[model samples]
Target chain A: AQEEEAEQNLSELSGPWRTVYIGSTNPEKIQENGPFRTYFRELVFDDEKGTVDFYFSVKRDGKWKNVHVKATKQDDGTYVADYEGQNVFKIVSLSRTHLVAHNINVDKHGQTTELTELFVKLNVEDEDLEKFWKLTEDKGIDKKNVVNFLENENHPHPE
Target chain B: EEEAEQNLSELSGPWRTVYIGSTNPEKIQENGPFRTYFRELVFDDEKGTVDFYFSVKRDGKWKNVHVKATKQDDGTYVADYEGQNVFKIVSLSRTHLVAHNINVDKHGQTTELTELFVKLNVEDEDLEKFWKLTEDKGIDKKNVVNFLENENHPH
Candidate 1:
C-alpha cells in the first residue's frame, strides 16, 4: 500500500543519468575497484520522497557486476546510503542535465574516503541519443540491474 | 578562399566529433561510427591545409585515421582517397564547429555528410586525474598522443 502511494508525487528530477567522470582523494580507490572512477548508467532522484537511487556496473575479478544503492535525504538535506560502507552525499552542483556531488564514505573499520563525481542526463535530442546509445552499447554497459531497484523496496541500512 | 582558410586556421585545435551522418550508411555501418572521437585538428595558414586525426573501431579493433584537406580557390576543402570529399566549414567558434561535406566516388556516386565537433577543453584538475590514471595503469606516454594542447606537432 505504501509502495503504491510512494509512486505519488514523483519528482521532476527523476530520470536516467550517466556518469561522465569521478575523482577520489584516495588514489587507491580509483586505482583498484573504482568506487570513485566508476561509470554510472543511471541515477534516479526522487525529490518528493527525498531519496536517490544509483545504478552502475563494475568490473571485478575478470567479470562485470551491477551495483545499486538507494540514498535517503536527512533533515539537513544531506544524503545517506550504504554500499561498501556508510556514505553521505553532498551536492556540489545540480542542473536539469548535470549533477556533481561529493560523497564521503566511512567503513566499518573506521577508514574514511571522499569522492566527487559528475553525471549527465541522457540527452534529449535524437542525434545525441543515437550516439549515446551506440556508445553505451559498444562500451558493454549493463542496465538490466536497474530493474531490481525499480521493482523492489530500497535496501535497508543501519541508522 | 583565403579568408575562410584564415578563419579555419584560427579555429584549429582539439575537436571532439559529436555527430556524423552519411547519406551512404554502408560506409559508416561497415565500421561502427566510432569516427566520433577526434584527437586533434591542425589548420595551417601558409599551406592552406587542415589535418584531421581521429580514432575508429573496425571489426572489434580500434585504429587511428589521418587525413589532410586542402583548400581550393572556391573556398572548399578537398581530400581524396575512398573518394573525393569537398568540405566546407559552415560555422566555427572557440567551442563548436559545424561542417558540411560531399563525397564523390570514382564511379560518380555521390553522398552528403554533416557533422558537429566540439573543442576538447580539459581543466587542469581533469588533466591531473587523467595523468594519475595513466600513471596508475602504467600506460606509456609515448603511445599517447596529445589531443588538446596541439602537442607532437600534429600539423
Candidate 2:
C-alpha cells in the first residue's frame, strides 16, 4: 500500500544514480550465494516531467550485458520499479549532490535479493568530481578497515 | 641512498608477476579500447636501482621498452626511459605490491598509472609452459634485432 503511494510521486525521483547492482532473476544464485557485483552503470534522470532513465553495461558469464532502468518515485520517500522484477528501493539517505538507496525485490519464483545504490550528482565542478571518485574508491570500506589502511601507511617499516 | 646503503638488506630480486592495479580512470573507462599488455619490473634494492621492461602493442607492433630506476630517501623513486616517471610504493606485501606512477613528458603532457604487482612463484619449467599457451602477435622485436645487429640500421 505504501509502495503504491510512492508510485504517484514518481516524478520526484528524477535521478542520475549509480547502478550498484540490479540483481539476478535466478533465485538459486541469491539464496545459496550472497550477491556479487552484478554490473555497474548509471541511471540518469532529466528534469522534464521528472523523466527517469538509466543505461549501464554489466559483466555476466564473462560477457557484457547492457540494461536500461526506469523508475518512478512514491509518496513515502521510496521508488519502485521492475528492474529484475518489482524491485523496491528506499532512499536511505539523500542530499543535493548525494543519494543512497537500497533495493529489495522478490522475483516471480519468490527468490529475494537486495542491492545498495550509491549516487553522486554529476555535471559538477571538476574538483567535486575528484572528491566523488575518491569517495567511491572507499565506498565499501568500514571504519576499522580505513583505520588499518591509514595505520599501515604510517608505519615506518613494511609488514 | 647512503641510508639505503646502510639498510641494504631490503627486498631485492626478480619478483614474479604479482598483481597490477590500474589507476588510469580515463583509459580504463572506455574499456581500454586499445591492445593492452603488461610491464615487467625488476628492482635492485641494494643498489637502489630498478629496471622496467614491458611489451606494448603500439602501431600494430609489440614494442619492448626498458627503463632504469634509482631510489631516493624521500619515499619516492624516479625512472628514465622514453620520458620521466615518478613511482611511489602504495602498498607492499610478500605476495602483493601496489604502486602509483606518474609520467611527465618534455611537452608537459602527463599521465598517471597505478598498478598492482603480485609475485609469481612459478618455476622455470612452468614459466616456459605458460608462454607455450600464447603466441606472439608482434613484429617490433624484429626491429629491435635489426637495429642491434645491423650497422646500416635500416628504418
Candidate 3:
C-alpha cells in the first residue's frame, strides 16, 4: 500500500499544468519578456532519479520560446536547477489537481528574487466547477468578487 | 523517499497552534474570529477532506467550532467560516503543518493568514533557524508575540 501510494503521488505530480497565478518579489521578473514569465505546459517526474523535467514556454524578445529545464531533488527535499539563474525551488503544496511552489533565484549579479506560483492541472472536470460554484453561492459570495481562474488571458497557452 | 508515501491520515491527531500571522492582524487579534485554538484534526484520505476542531472566543464567550474543509480539484480546500475560506496546506509533516488561508467576510473584506501548528514541542534547531531568518528580515525579536503561550488560554 505504501508503494502504491508513492506511485499515485508521483503520477499526480506528472501531467499537464497551467499557471493560475505567479507572483515575484521583483516585479521585473514576471513582467513582459521577463525570464520568470513562464507558462507551464507539462511536468515529467522521474521517481527513481529524483528529478523533475519542467516543460514550459516563455515570451522573450517579442517571441514565445519553448523551454525545458530539469531540476534535481536535493537531500533536504528541495529541488535545485540552473536556469537563467541559479534556482532553488520547493513544492510547498501539492494535490492531484494543483501544485503550489516557491522558488528562490540568485542571478549572476547575486541579486535574489523570490517567487510563488500556483499551478492547476489542465482540463479540470466540469463537475468540480459545479461543486465549487455551488459552494460559493452557498457562502453568498458575489459573482463579481469571485475570480475566474479557468479562463485567463493574461497567461496564454503555449503555442 | 519514505515521506513520499506517508498518508495524510497518519498525521491526524491532536494539534496545537503555534503562530498565526495575518495581513490584517485584527483578524487574529484577541476576540477576532480567526483567533482559533486548534484541538484536533481528522483527515480522510479517501474523501480528500480535513475536519478541523477548534475553539474561538467570540462575544467574550468561548465556543468550540467544527469546520469541515472539502478539498477541491485545484488542490485547495474551501470551507465556510466567517463567510468563505479557501485554504491550502503549504507544507505538512508528521510533527508540523504549515497552511495559508484566505478568508472573505460577508462585507467583502478579505484577510490572508498563515498558520503553523505542531503535534509536539518545536525542535530547538528549528526555532534557532526561525530566529535567524527573522533577524535576516530585520524584524525585532521583541516585536514577535507568543500566541502559543497566552495567559488567558492554556494549551
Candidate 4:
C-alpha cells in the first residue's frame, strides 16, 4: 500500500528541475530590483517528502543578491508552501520534465496578486529532448483533475 | 523531410505571453533592483523545438532579455530565456486555458506557479497599450516591440 501511495504521490511529482527560468511578466522589474537575475543556478528535490529546494537571484543597488526556497508536494499531489511565502500552486499538467501551475498572492495587507508558472525537468539535452518527452509522459498525474481537498492538514499559506 | 519540417514547425508559430508572478519582496533588494511583480514568457513551437524569449525590468529600464528552449513529448516545455520558464499547457477549451511555469531559486529549491490565461484575444492596438503600460519603467519601447515582433505571435 505504501508503495502504491508513493507512486501515486510521485505521479504528482518526480521530474527534472532547475532553479532557473521564472516565467513572470516582468523579468525587467525583477532586474530593476537588481542588475542580474541569477538563474539555472541549483535545484534539490526529495522523493520521500516530495519536496524541492532551489535558488536564484538578481543584483540590486550595487551587490548581488541570492534567493532560495523550498517546495513540498502535499498528499493531494498539489505542491504548496515555498520559500519567500509562495503557496497556492495547483498542478495544471505535468510529465517527467514539464509542469504547469498557478497561485494567487495574498499579502499581509490583504492585497492579492495572481501568478502563473511552468517548470520543466532539466538535464534534458537538446539533441534528444523529444525522446525524453516521450519518456516523461504522465510523469506526475494521478486521477486527473481531482481537486484534492485537504481538510485535516495544516498549511502555511495564510499570507 | 516532412518530419524535419515538423521539427522546425515546433519552433515556428505564434506564442502568447505569460508573466511569472513573485511575492517574495526580498528578491528585489538582493538583486539590487526593485521588486519585479512578474516575468515575461513567449514561446514559439517550431522545428521540433520551442523558440523562447524572456525579459525582466532592471534599474528602472527593461533589459537582461535572452532566448532558448527545448521540448519533450511528455507535454513539457523547458526554456531558458531570462530566468527559467518551464511551460506546460494542460487543457484547451474554447476560450479558457490553463498552464503552469516552474522555477528554481538560488538555494537549490523549486517554486511552482500556475495560472489560467483566458486568451484575452487582444487586438494589436490593445497589445500596444499593454506594452506601453510600463514605458517609463525600465525596458525601452524599441526593445519591447522588437521582443514582441520576434517572439510573440498571434496564436
Evaluated with lDDT, which candidate comes out highest? 3
Off by over 4 Å in 2: A1-36, A117-159, B1-83, B86-155
Task: Give each prediction's DockQ, rounded to 2 decimals.
Answer: 0.06, 0.02, 0.02, 0.04
lDDT of 1 by residue, B30-88 (tens): 35432334657888989989898776556665556788999999878999746888988
Model 3: per-residue Cα lDDT at residue A71? 96
Residue range B77-101, candidate 2, lDDT tens digits? 8977446888887666433455666
Q: After superposition, how far is residue A113 of candidate 4 from its true place, in Å?
A: 2.0
- Model 1 lDDT tens row, A38-157: 546567777667788888665566455678889998866678999778998886556565565677888778788766665555333445434434533443433321112112222111
- What does candidate 2's lDDT look like per residue over A16-123, in tens digits? 333211223333333212223332234555544444566644345554455677767654555677765677767665544444455677766777755443443322
Error of 4 at A148 (Å): 41
If scored against the real structure, what TM-score would every candidate get?
A: 0.56, 0.37, 0.40, 0.34
Top TM-score hit? 1
lDDT of each: 0.58, 0.42, 0.67, 0.39
Instruction: State the lDDT of candidate 3 residue by residue for A76-141, as single tens digits.
Output: 678999998999998766666556677899999999987766565543334434444454454454
Q: What order do candidates take by DockQ, descending? A: 1, 4, 3, 2
Among the candidates, what TM-score does chain A have in each? Answer: 0.68, 0.50, 0.72, 0.50
Model 3 is docked with a DockQ of: 0.02
Q: Which tens-of-lDDT digit does each residue in B1-155 have in candidate 4?
A: 12232332322332222222232323323232222221233344444354433233454444433455567788787865335667776644322334555655555555444433322122333333333433423334332212223222211
What does the lDDT read for residue A87 in candidate 3?
Answer: 98
